[PDB]
Ligand binder design. Structure first.
Ligand SMILES: NC(=O)c1ccc[n+]([C@@H]2O[C@H](COP(=O)([O-])OP(=O)(O)OC[C@H]3O[C@@H](n4cnc5c(N)ncnc54)[C@H](OP(=O)(O)O)[C@@H]3O)[C@@H](O)[C@H]2O)c1
Ligand SMILES: NC(=O)c1ccc[n+]([C@@H]2O[C@H](COP(=O)([O-])OP(=O)(O)OC[C@H]3O[C@@H](n4cnc5c(N)ncnc54)[C@H](OP(=O)(O)O)[C@@H]3O)[C@@H](O)[C@H]2O)c1
Ligand SMILES: [Cl-]
Lengths: 222, 220
């Protein structure tokens, strides 16, 4: 197993950290301030989740990234650059950075829109801000539940995408995705293909409304 | 059998016009200038005689006589094509919008304009407020719009976006007649944003898979 740092204490971070730990990886979870995160009483609260996953350990973004071989970005999209900067470019250099964030924009009305979008992407922004990291955009196109148990929606009949400049990095991420139950991994190409992957979110949001559930997924039929 | 006007002489317009004529509809195909179009270089002049029931005429002349109108024009020019068709000829009728507002001004692959906070489907609806705009079929290759069974046995999804639920219901019936068994109503015309925004990944999937013979399926 690998030493994996999951930056994010929300549903995605918890879901991924728990699943990766169950697969035999040594998993740490990154947060801005561990004391503040553990002190949160409002919901569930992170302090109620952590005791159920005894093999997972909490620390600040910089501390978890420095100790990990591979890093997973599961932070709020609008804050991902800030989170990763706090993690430290020096702690990301030469390592695979799995980017699951969506750059949702909740500033000017509902449902959210994307920023950046179309001619740019959060995946690209992360890669050019941290040029020595090996960014792989993946898993952002489905509900957290399906990232680790895709079988819950239509017997696991679905597609997952990878985007990234380093083919060897994408191959390693594909192996991890397969270990999580994803049998159809499609390589969209370089990191600029994160634009199309991120741009699936607007229809995802409308499908959630139209279908009355987040238990659905995209399948590329061919 | 409805009177359908298909605005567009490219692969989408030809494919849709031919399929609808084969289904029993009285189909007309719209172009800017019939004389100029037939004078080109397969060429439209060779396609047209193979579909004798389909009639070619100017945009304004096909829309006036039609009961339902299909937009199959270049996305960047759709507002101009429909303006030429005439707002008076679109009033009270279903306007099926298949166009994608691809933007080729800054190289390849194309991006979208409008995008994100706006869509071509919305632009069309607010420019022609009395038309009943329904965004659909823009998310797949022309071949699959009329014969979806060609890709993975037809296991795919098609979307409808539009403000008028009765208009969407009529379009859903037409889509079913074309072989689309899974029609998903995304909601109002602003949901055309998500439908149009599937194109960037579509373009990369075409490159990644080496074929246009694929489709989106929403598994649930
Ligand atoms: N919800 C889903 O099922 C789903 C599906 C696909 C993709 N995504 C994407 O996955 C990401 C995570 O979503 P989520 O719902 O689990 O959590 P989230 O609420 O979007 O993000 C919470 C995390 O972001 C960090 N964060 C928030 N503001 C920050 C800032 N100012 N500076 C640095 N870090 C900040 C938090 O740090 P602290 O720990 O210190 O609070 C926390 O770790 C998002 O980008 C989302 O769009 C979510
Ligand atoms: N290719 C596909 O399988 C596919 C799939 C899904 C959606 N779409 C969308 O479907 C639409 C049609 O695509 P296409 O490849 O069949 O044809 P296209 O090349 O995009 O469009 C050709 C049509 O647009 C009209 N047009 C071009 N410039 C115009 C202008 N300045 N003013 C008025 N009309 C103008 C042409 O008029 P004339 O007849 O006078 O030349 C012609 O009828 C596009 O929006 C495209 O994005 C295509
Ligand atoms: Cl554990």
């Amino acid at each position: 197993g690998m030493k994996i740092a999951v930056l994010g204490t929300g549903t995605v971070g918890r879901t991924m950290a728990g699943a990766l730990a169950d697969l035999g990886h040594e998993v740490t979870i990154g947060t801005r301030d561990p004391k503040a995160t553990l002190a949160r009483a409002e919901p569930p609260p992170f302090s109620q989740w952590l005791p159920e996953h005894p093999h997972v350990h909490l620390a600040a973004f910089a501390d978890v990234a420095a100790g990990a071989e591979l890093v997973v970005n599961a932070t709020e999209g609008a804050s991902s650059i800030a989170a990763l900067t706090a993690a430290g470019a020096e702690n990301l250099a030469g390592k695979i950075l799995v980017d699951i964030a969506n750059p949702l924009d909740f500033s000017h009305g509902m449902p959210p829109t994307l920023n950046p979008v179309n001619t740019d992407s959060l995946g690209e922004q992360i890669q050019r801000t941290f040029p020595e990291a090996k960014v792989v955009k993946t898993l952002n196109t489905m509900n957290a539940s399906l990232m680790v148990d895709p079988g819950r929606a239509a017997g696991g009949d679905h597609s997952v995408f990878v985007s990234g400049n380093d083919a060897a990095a994408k191959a390693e991420v594909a192996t991890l995705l397969k270990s999580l139950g994803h049998q159809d991994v499609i390589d969209l190409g370089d990191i600029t293909t994160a634009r199309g992957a991120e741009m699936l979110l607007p229809v995802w949001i409308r499908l959630w409304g139209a279908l009355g559930t987040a238990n659905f997924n995209f399948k590329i039929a061919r």
